[PDB]
TrEMBL record, chain A:
This is Chromosome partition protein MukB. The chain holds residues 841 to 890 of 1482 of the full protein. It is found in: Cytoplasm, Nucleoid. Plays a central role in chromosome condensation, segregation and cell cycle progression. Functions as a homodimer, which is essential for chromosome partition. Involved in negative DNA supercoiling in vivo, and by this means organize and compact chromosomes. May achieve or facilitate chromosome segregation by condensation DNA from both sides of a centrally located replisome during cell division. Transmembrane segments: none annotated. Belongs to the SMC family. MukB subfamily. Homodimerization via its hinge domain. Binds to DNA via its C-terminal region. Interacts, and probably forms a ternary complex, with MukE and MukF via its C-terminal region. The complex formation is stimulated by calcium or magnesium. Interacts with tubulin-related protein FtsZ. It comes from Photorhabdus thracensis. The gene is mukB. The hinge domain, which separates the large intramolecular coiled coil regions, allows the homodimerization, forming a V-shaped homodimer.
């Protein structure tokens, strides 16, 4: 059972990491999306670089 | 005499103000987008509330 524990811990470590990175990327995805939400809707059109 | 004086009163003003036409064209065009986008966003918000 202790060997089982060590191996399950390996797997859980892998998942904990994968989550730790993944969430960074996808939080950044929604963040960049918020940047777009700020920019485009009208601002890109009045700040149309006239 | 008086009428003619009024005409030559206006004439300086006439050219001076008529000079502004083209600025006014761009102005009206630009404000049109305000109208259009306000109406569009009004749509969007009403659709959401529904």
């Amino acid at each position: 059972l202790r060997q089982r524990h060590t191996e399950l811990e390996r797997e859980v470590s892998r998942f904990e990491d994968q989550t730790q990175q993944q969430r960074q990327q996808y939080a950044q995805a929604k963040e960049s999306l918020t940047t777009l939400n700020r920019l485009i809707p009208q601002v890109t059109l009045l700040l149309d670089e006239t | 005499w008086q009428s003619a004086r009024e005409l030559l009163r206006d004439w300086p003003s006439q050219r001076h103000l008529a000079d502004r036409v083209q600025p006014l064209r761009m102005r009206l065009s630009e404000l049109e987008q305000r109208l259009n986008n306000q109406q569009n966003a009004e749509r969007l918000l009403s659709e959401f509330c529904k």
